[model samples]
Target: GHMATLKVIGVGGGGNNAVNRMIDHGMNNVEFIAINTDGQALNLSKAESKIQIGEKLTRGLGAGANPEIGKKAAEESREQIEDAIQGADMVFVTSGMGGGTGTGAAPVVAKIAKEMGALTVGVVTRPFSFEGRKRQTQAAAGVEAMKAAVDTLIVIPNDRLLDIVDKSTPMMEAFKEADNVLRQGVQGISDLIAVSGEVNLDFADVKTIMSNQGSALMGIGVSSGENRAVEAAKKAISSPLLETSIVGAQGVLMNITGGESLSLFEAQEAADIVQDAADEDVNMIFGTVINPELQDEIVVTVIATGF
Candidate 1:
């Protein structure tokens, strides 16, 4: 007599920011929580619940961009963190790494969520190249810690955004694009479980594809017009984040979306297109969604893990 619950927790400034935008984007059956060392910033979040962590340590002043302080703060609020995420069946820990709270504390948060039995995934971003090597080194260390703690980790390097935007784009606008990458990551995975589609995929199915994997790759492609499914499938696997290829991945979770006119064979063909790109024995779990208004378009969301 239990219903699966998904929780998305933002652990620091960037993390909290990402969660806020996600709240605006909106999704069903998912809860949003913001945890931060800075009380003032935490107060600004639109999440349903909030936890002001390490009140005594940081005195709500934040981690001062020091990862050591970040780690200590989370340690100081271990119980609060535990209580906040206790009942989730799945947890998405989103943060922009290289900062104090996110780089140091996010791994601790993910570890606790995992220890408590939730299938945890961390969606984080690397600092831009201009942020300095010191921050980059700190981020690398944080990624190492996260790799050991979460079921799967999807990292979006902020520097990659430069390649996607125009030189005239505003700095903040460029940063927003980075956040969208994270947004897409969480939405795609959550959609697999939260959205009841023509072919259903639940929490158990997602767990089978994500649990115990290390760094994972995610790609989402939305295409319209002729050969939409094939075109979307191709774009999904060749996304910027998937530079290394999904050739050796052991597990894959994919979802295909289209209008009511989407035939079963079309969905099957899309799945096969992705399957042929991976190992012959790769364990893949996929589902199909039909949107009446999505008359001539197709969207493919693909995640490859256990590489």
Candidate 2:
């Protein structure tokens, strides 16, 4: 099923930059918007929609890195957010939850979006270690708020980014890569629920699987050549991107997609591998879709919840 109406929102200055990068990189079939108190940051974004909150509160400056001010700004702009996300089938909130705006406003955005009758998800980034423990604690609090408000939450800690990229990597390049991963995540979920696959897990199923209580992890792997399904699933399981301890998952849903050459046996094997790696009591379900474009490759998307 195609998305009739989906809204992707970036809350605060840092959040706006991330979403701005994603928009510049290229995204389709959704409304991209940014919520910020700083007019300059809003202008910098190329998103289809932009909402500037806390005009009087911030006096066109910023949240001053204080969460209380950020919360107040969002509170004053409550009406704008309600109207922005109206009629949205799914809403994705992205932000770096540390500074004033992000720490205080992201959860408010997610909570308000859901109240507007949308399936809300948040991909929040924690503060980097160099930012200090104070920022980290604030980010942790913001994450808690997001988790309580949104249907599903994907948390990416800034420090963990070091594990994904080399120390010698250029700062710009590292940031670009991190933001790209987040972009891929948003796009992947959009495709999973929007496009019909072989076995088919429509938006409703995706929502049901994702709306489960607690934190969530998404894993995807792609492989080409012969035996791509097995290879891809194995890579997904062992990839540094995912947690090594898989048995802690309480609920899991997977999707296997390939081109016209995809075989029933291959799909089954991939599903078996996923199940084998998960706890026996894990609530698991999977689907398949034939893309024909992959002819010899397979893409696996897994959503694991809990722990």
Candidate 3:
């Protein structure tokens, strides 16, 4: 039996990909759900044997550069999320673009989850400011809105990830690297929550931890020695004020951007610095490693749980 119930919901243009990835991770206890403008939610439901909520709105409209369209999608999806939150223990929401379904729907869903007494966390990817001025603006607005609705928001910046990938790398490679970072972070959090043990923390605990956690993003150079890079990563992870938190935790989320050729062992070693500092028995840890070769930086979001 599952120790806790996790409902994974994907909203907007990237919803399908997010849902598919969760299912591919082989988490039987997790229920995959999708909410979008059409009945793609239904398709995903059937594919993963999970629930679906389809808002009768136009696609692309909710997820494009228009804030109004995004707002409408959020309004429509809010009802669907309210209904889904009734018996759920926790809800993990993922979305890429900030203009459409996810930017709008995710916040509404999170607000409803709070009302229903469920812990809600949103994992969003921000378009690199360098990508385009318009995209950056949209993403910034989405992040602000999401922060108000959810207890905690984890943001992975694409530009930051892209900077890690080689300038010569193809767009597809950059995207794949970004996806790997996202998947790793989500998977790490999910594993921490789903795994049963003596020090099992619940959604509420996670919210509390995030509420008091501080974070920073760091970028290292390709020519920078590995030891120097690891040290720099550690500094970013440790910069957060962990000792003052009420929950008594020193946790870190390490997001790396590079390519498939990046060394997992090196990443692991870098991650160990943060893990070693975590409180015994009661702490939360989350992170992701993307294409490390293309970019020379590691972004670490550290959380110190307070009482």
By lDDT, the best candidate is 1
Per-prediction TM-score, please? 0.92, 0.92, 0.63
Model 2: per-residue lDDT, tens digit, 1-307? 2555778899997788888788887688878888998888888888878889899998987898898888889999999989888889888898888899988989899999888778787877888889999988888889888888898887777776688787688877766755765676677777876787667776776677677446766677899987788888876555343222455776777888888888889888888888887777887778888886666778888877665
Tens-digit per-residue lDDT, 209-294, candidate 1: 88998877778888988788888998888756423477778898888989888888778878888898787888998888888988
Model 3 Cα lDDT, one tens digit per residue, 1-307: 5455667677665655656655665555566666665454445443343333333456322344455665676675565557665676667666765556566666776677767766666667787666688877877787777777765565677656555666688875565554553354445446555544232444444555554233312122232345644664565443221112222344433343344444667667655655565555545444444533445444333343322
**Which runs of model 2 end up more than 4 angstroms from their true locations?**
237-246
Q: State the lDDT at 111 in candidate 1.
A: 96
- Estimate the TM-score for candidate 3: 0.63
Q: What are the lDDT figures for the candidates, one per model?
A: 0.84, 0.79, 0.54
Give the deviation of candidate 3 from the true structure as CA RMSD.
9.1
Model 3, total clashes: 24
For candidate 1, report its TM-score: 0.92
Error of 2 at 8 (Å): 0.9
Which candidate, 1 or 3, would have the higher TM-score against the true structure?
A: 1
RMSD of each: 2.1, 2.1, 9.1
Positional deviation of residue 225's Cα in model 1 after best superposition, in angstroms: 1.5
For residue 245, what is the lDDT in candidate 3? 24
Going through the candidates in the order shown, the clash numbers are: 0, 5, 24
